[PDB]
């Protein structure tokens, strides 16, 4: 009919496979009608030039989250299916590269020499595909190594009030990884991937500058998604960082991924979800926020002997927004992670730097990922510190303290001063084993509290001068034998009068 012909005239003339037409857009979240060959999690190329992946598939409207800005999108445009679930180039070339979420070099060190591409979501290594955690990981902070050991594969959460040099605690780990990196044997090396999500371009710029200053960008990869850059790209940013890590892990290389801060990932998913209009959960975070964090974190592992040796180690960082340990985003992560390394703001002011709150800091997986020697010296270090804490409470109720209590107190004070150590100064195990030996064997108890730091500096210098043979052995065999214990005992005694 003339009617039927005219209907053909007004017909869409697209089968809406490989294409579909935008129909409402704004708030950075488009909504398209069409795309009936859409694959979930696929990347869809807007004809504005924008690409946005698609996260919501509705019974007529595919909800495509823009990666770009909406000021280039205009309603009624066609979007054409990329036909690919999101994937990033992964390779050796990422070493010494800052890259944005879509893997574009944003430091302009030109193209990434990518040996593969990988996918944003990848199922975690199974029960059978893992072997138990043997190797240590040292941050060169005396407190971390001694109190809450880090092992390859293990997930340890750095948690504590925001911007208490939150970035810096993690950065210290990167700095001590200079010692293995400079050396040889890649199974003893950790390549380091520092992921910075939601931080200002200037903050990132400071990070790259510090890393270049310590020449640690000779082994670092920086995956970035700055604050300005879109919320979908921010949501995608930890998961594609993970993919970059998995390439190292897969190659059998042991590496470590810092995810700073996941707290901003949660905000990103919040924005995204609430503008995909999924019903929001407690604290305005949907329920699969627990899932979001869990799937991300469990892709760190120490692979079974069968499946090589490579271990991605993870250090998530959650910046607590009040120190409320019951906040939803903190609660979820705490359950997920293998250890928690709580910091305390007051202790930062108290001058304990790093400000690790030793009592709130735990490592569930525990010792079997720290140097055998260091295990020996720090044997009762935990107990002493805990006793110091208990005693300290008693001391502040001003009750008369007997000498036995004051033995604890005196030992305790020295230990606290021993923990302190200014930022950006890693310390090798060979020179942490003596200091902890000295403390636990009470050689520090005598010397005056004010000059403990001076003594520490000097003690190390003395061992460097005289018992540098002893130091070489502590490095080489990494366990204190009877002979070493006696040598070390004598050495400490020798410099016990300073």
């Amino acid at each position: 009919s003339i009617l039927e012909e005219r209907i053909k005239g007004v017909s869409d003339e697209a089968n809406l496979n490989e294409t579909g037409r935008v129909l409402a857009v704004g708030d950075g979240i488009a909504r398209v009608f069409g795309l009936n060959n859409i694959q979930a999690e696929e990347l869809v190329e807007f004809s504005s030039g924008v690409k946005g992946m698609a996260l919501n598939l509705e019974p007529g409207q595919v909800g495509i989250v823009l990666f770009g800005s909406d000021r280039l999108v205009k309603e009624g445009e066609l979007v054409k299916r990329t036909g690919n679930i999101v994937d990033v180039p992964v390779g050796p070339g990422l070493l010494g590269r800052v890259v944005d979420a879509l893997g574009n070099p944003i430091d302009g060190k030109g193209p990434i020499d990518a040996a593969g591409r990988s996918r944003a979501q990848v199922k975690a290594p199974g029960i059978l595909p893992r072997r138990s955690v043997h190797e240590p990981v040292q941050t060169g902070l005396k407190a971390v190594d001694a109190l809450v050991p880090i092992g390859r594969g293990q997930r340890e959460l750095i948690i504590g009030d925001r911007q208490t040099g939150k970035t810096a605690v993690a950065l210290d780990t990167i700095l001590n990884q200079k010692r293995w990196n400079n050396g040889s044997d890649e199974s003893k090396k950790l390549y380091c991937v520092y992921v910075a999500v939601g931080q200002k371009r200037s903050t990132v710029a400071q990070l790259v500058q510090t890393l270049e200053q310590h020449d640690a960008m000779k082994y670092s990869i920086i995956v970035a998604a700055t604050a300005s850059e879109a919320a979908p790209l921010q949501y995608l940013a930890p998961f594609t960082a993970a993919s970059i890590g998995e390439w190292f892990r897969d190659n059998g290389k042991h590496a470590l991924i810092v995810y700073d801060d996941l707290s901003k990932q949660a905000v990103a998913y919040r924005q995204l979800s609430l503008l995909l209009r999924r019903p929001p959960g407690r604290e305005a975070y949907p329920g699969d926020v627990f899932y979001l964090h869990s799937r991300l974190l469990e892709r760190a592992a120490k692979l079974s002997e069968k499946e090589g040796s490579g271990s991605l180690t993870a250090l998530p960082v959650i910046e607590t927004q009040g120190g409320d340990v019951s906040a939803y985003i903190p609660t979820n992560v705490i359950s997920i992670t293998d250890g928690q390394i709580f910091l305390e703001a007051e202790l930062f002011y108290k001058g304990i730097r790093p400000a690790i709150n030793v009592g709130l800091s735990v490592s569930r997986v525990g010792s079997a990922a720290q140097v055998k020697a260091l295990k020996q010296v720090a044997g009762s270090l935990k107990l002493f510190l805990a006793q110091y804490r208990e005693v300290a409470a008693f001391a502040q109720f001003g009750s008369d303290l007997d000498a036995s209590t004051k033995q604890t107190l005196v030992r305790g004070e020295r230990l606290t001063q021993l923990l302190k150590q200014n930022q950006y100064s890693p310390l090798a195990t060979e020179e942490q084993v003596p200091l902890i030996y000295a403390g636990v064997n009470g050689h520090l108890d005598g010397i005056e509290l004010s000059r403990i730091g001076e003594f520490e500096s000097s003690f190390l210098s003395y061992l460097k001068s005289n018992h540098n043979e002893l130091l070489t052995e502590i490095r080489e065999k990494g366990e204190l034998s009877k002979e070493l214990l006696a040598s070390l005992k004598s050495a400490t005694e020798s410099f016990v009068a300073t």
């Binding site: 009919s1 003339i2 009617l3 039927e4 005219r6 209907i7 053909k8 007004v10 017909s11 869409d12 037409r21 129909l23 009608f33 007529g60």
Partner: protein
Amino acid sequence: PPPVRLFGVEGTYATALYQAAAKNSSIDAAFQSLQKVESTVKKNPKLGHLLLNPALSLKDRNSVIDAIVETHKNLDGYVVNLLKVLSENNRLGCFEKIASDFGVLNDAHNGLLKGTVTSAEPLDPKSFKRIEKALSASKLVGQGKSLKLENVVKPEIKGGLIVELGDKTVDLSISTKIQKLNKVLED
């Protein structure tokens, strides 16, 4: 307000159409035109039923309306005002739904009732007739109302019958009795 109120949107349209055309006392005309346009939608099976999908604009929609009155200008006109309304409210996916709903209201106005004899298999015509007679005889069909008793085949209901009309049913079926029987022997 006119008898029988079908709750639910699109039947809010139907109710309006019904009541409007009842008050214009041109329900047969409306019904007839509705059948014709429903038929011409069905008989425009591609490119006029497969483009009842939303995507078209208001302006593109207006030209769809023009095509609808182009297919036959034998339309009642109250239903042409309804067509305009549906275009303006930008829904027409539920167009035949509204037609069907108007049909229920209309044939309620006529008095006609529908029933059902779901069974596992199509029964005797004798059974059909006897039940139709019986239902008409019984107070169940009040009279001044008619019964289109429809046997349907539902193999899922094993044998039996269920007589249905006026939201009142008598279900003498083997499956249901079996259910109660199985249960009584679980005691």
